[PDB]
């Protein structure tokens, strides 16, 4: 069933014999943070909350320890899909409050909640169904992660068929046992790459599921002897892993985007919503692609989009409109990758789209041709912009973006840039083995 | 002695029993190209020249065979510093001519010659003595180049002392036997790094010597069991290899930089010459640093300069003025690295310097403080610009500079950009092992 | 004490090993044992004072004052092994300067924002290798002496001490913990307060055991010296 009250949560713990409760939250950079609580402490925790070191939220750039209180949310209680011999294990989420009682504005969850509240002012609510892609490599003799492939299958192939097939089935069953209500799961284009699709739901609920999904899959692979990786591009010459985001705005219980009277069956609001996304997508690209490796995926020649355009039939466009209509009307953004922070990513997508609706931003003519096959003069003639080439370029764009700072708040804005800035500086000074293979003999 | 005429060259060949003659020239990208000629063919070659595939000058971007004729220059004849049992070996240089008789404008040597003529129009001549730095690594069991250090010495250290010491001495003796007139040779800051200072001499002769110097040292190291490398940054965490250039302008047989009546003992022309270099240095930075690895060396925290400034006492400044005065007055530019093309690098340095003198560009106030210790606001307040961060940024700067296009000519300009552009695109899509170490387990 | 061998026994039977070294690896944070403490009289916390701006009683100020005055003397007890002082180096969460603060965390003594019955004082110097009986006993005795003598703790340090200069530290009068085990023994060896608290028998025995241990360590040639000096000299 679904637990809504602390009394129901306590009854479930006693009934199913849950021994440990794990909190769940994410830092600014998207890493999943958690700590354990004994089952006996749960009743007191609901009454007064838990004090913890909140400097972990600010990432690995923390300097001074700061204390603030976490208040648990009973509606987010759920039981993890593995049964140790000792007893059951369950997780829970909550809100972060400063000692003075004010909510902490640096929490990525709070950022999304403000965005939801902003949409509520206009009477809109958003549903998101994301498509998550990941790899399944082999472990070495020491159990460390590797990049050894498990099968040479292709798109939608009936692979794997060896014992790795049971591992994949266990992941699907475990997610269903948690009530995620998966739509479909299939092999992807690259070898040993798989994709899992989510049903539509409230954006807040979906974001929590995505965070839970990540460490659930990783835990299962270890106990079966494999490893699940979420790198945007772990291998060269094969397709990368992305997290497309199908999204829709609901007002008064009906889909805003759908419009039977238009030739494209899309409402005027949907045109503005796309226009807002196109205008600002360049600014917050760093949030959707946070790590350096994400830009090894955004290169021409694969399914990854690198040009800013929208289309109804073409797939190379950054924004794609699926042929489904009615309540299923949706907009798919193909830039993000699983390494992104779902809370920050969705919040910016919602805020950027709403701004376009308010300002009646025109999305322009759709691009129904192959942009890659075109020439630079044609792209210049058509005014087709491109996404940032590297992480440093993305930071420079984000940094001066007034809109991004307003949406994310000052505290998150400054902390996010500093962490990324330090990461890029370390990477730019490394001498990669590719240079040695190319320049040692030549020079 | 010095050979002047073809009769003298032929007499020397017969006297010293030279069996093979090797032509010498470089392509646009700086690679050394050569082919062999039997001694008997030499007399015919002097009379009519040698037909050869001239498409090799255009680099590895060549598409179609094209025939140009090389007219040998007797004044460049020299004998290589090794004695095969069969007989002696000699090298020679010459000019490239199109079949219709017009000189080929794509030759890097011709680019420098045009620059000299432009300087000669103002009555000036240039003398350049460079300081070349290189490493000395061990060879594996198969003779392939590797990166194992031969000693852990430091700056000016009396190292190495093992059998590698004899190899180092052999290089010095061989160069002296060539008539190079080496100034001084010493150990450098990084382990197994050495530096050799060339005699302060004419620019045209110096450029040919630098090209000859590179393959002479490499050949000696192989036959002694070691390997000499010219990578701008072969190891991480240690100093890179650079090629500082000291240049001076002479009019009517006297140095024009030296002014006894000024407090700094520098003439007004020298100030303008520095001003021209500072203005245009950003544009042709790609020529001085042509490979991707060059920009790994150009990072803060080492001897490499990354800020556009000039000083008299400071070292981190891009342009340094040595305390020597009088006839030895000189200006040192510290940006280039040994991987650069000496013909193109010197030619642009001359043309940029003259343009400052012609237009009377003020170099501004010198920077006597440590720039690295200053803050970004201070640098913004002081208006201190920085060199391009990576090869892609340098290409973008150099691709719009009309001054570089005018100096290098249309043919060299277009070919150089395309070759670098293709090289960068290949590098930007690689997944380096550093990314795997950082991201495979975290994500 | 029970916790230590319980964890170690479990790890063995599962195939792993649990270590309590104050600094087992170089370049990463060490393991410390912070000690939150509070004093209760008549069933009520004595540190909490609702009438003060910092919600701290006058006794709490004296208790901190006593700890700061004597912390240098019994530092050896809290950090009993040689490895303990590899952890006490600048650049990590370990404190190496004697100060107290409310918001800063690098301070030796940190006061958590919790108030009321949960008011507590955290000392961040000890490490798990210390003897809990001796460490707590000295920690209690030092605090009581401050309360009895009304030692003023001085102004708190709300700035980052590591970022300050030596002249600033000299101007502010900020002391530092002993650098190595030998320095700590010299301080603890002339301290009459430590001798009085621990008793004559424990005092003499503890010093001799540590003294012999340090002497053995100071005469070893570590492989780090060979790497740096064998080729250079
Ligand atoms: Mg897919
Ligand atoms: Mg040098």
Author numbering:
A (entry chain A), B (entry chain V): 5 to 447
C (entry chain B): 215 to 447
Source paper text:
The enzyme, glutamine synthetase (GS; EC 6.3.1.2, L-glutamate: ammonia ligase) plays a central role in cellular nitrogen assimilation by incorporating ammonium into glutamine, which serves as a carbon and nitrogen donor for the biosynthesis of nucleotides, amino acids and lipids. Here we describe a structural dissection of the archaeal Methanosarcina mazei (Mm) GS and its regulation. Like the Gram-positive GS, the Mm GS active sites are formed at the interface between two subunits in the hexamer and are comprised of five regions; the E flap (Mm residues 303–310), the Y loop (residues 369–377), the N loop (residues 235–247), the Y179 loop (residues 152–161) and the D50 ´ loop (residues 56-71), which is the only active site region contributed from the adjacent subunit. Like other GS dodecamers, the Mm GS dodecamer is formed by two interfaces; hexamer and inter-hexamer interfaces.
To next gain structural insight into Mm GS we utilized cryo-electron microscopy (Cryo-EM). These experiments, performed with apo Mm GS at ~20 μM, revealed that 14% of the sample was captured in a partially oligomerized form with the remaining particles adopting a dodecameric state; particles corresponding to monomers/dimers were not processed due to their small sizes. The fully oligomerized Mm GS structure, which was resolved to 3.0 Å resolution, is composed of a dodecamer with stacked hexamer rings. Similar to these GS structures, each Mm GS subunit is composed of 15 β-strands and 15 α-helices and each subunit is divided into a larger C-domain and an N-domain by helix α3. As expected, structural homology searches showed that Mm GS subunits display the strongest similarity to subunits of Gram-positive bacterial GS structures, with root mean squared deviations (rmsds) of 0.5–1.0 Å for 430 similar Cα atoms compared to the Bs GS, Lm GS, Sa GS and Pp GS18. The inter-hexamer/thong contacts in the Mm GS and the bacterial GS structures are essentially identical. By contrast, the hexamer interfaces differ in structure and sequence in a region corresponding to Mm GS residues 165–169. In Mm GS residues 165-168 form an extra turn of helix and residues 167-168, which are an arginine and alanine, are positioned outside the oligomer interface; unlike the leucine, the arginine in Mm GS cannot bind within the hydrophobic pocket. Interestingly, Mm residues 165–169 are proximal to the catalytic Y179 loop, suggesting this region could impact GS active site formation. For these experiments we compared samples of apo Mm GS and apo Bs GS at concentrations of 75 nM. These experiments showed that 97% of the apo Mm GS was present as dimers with no dodecamers present.
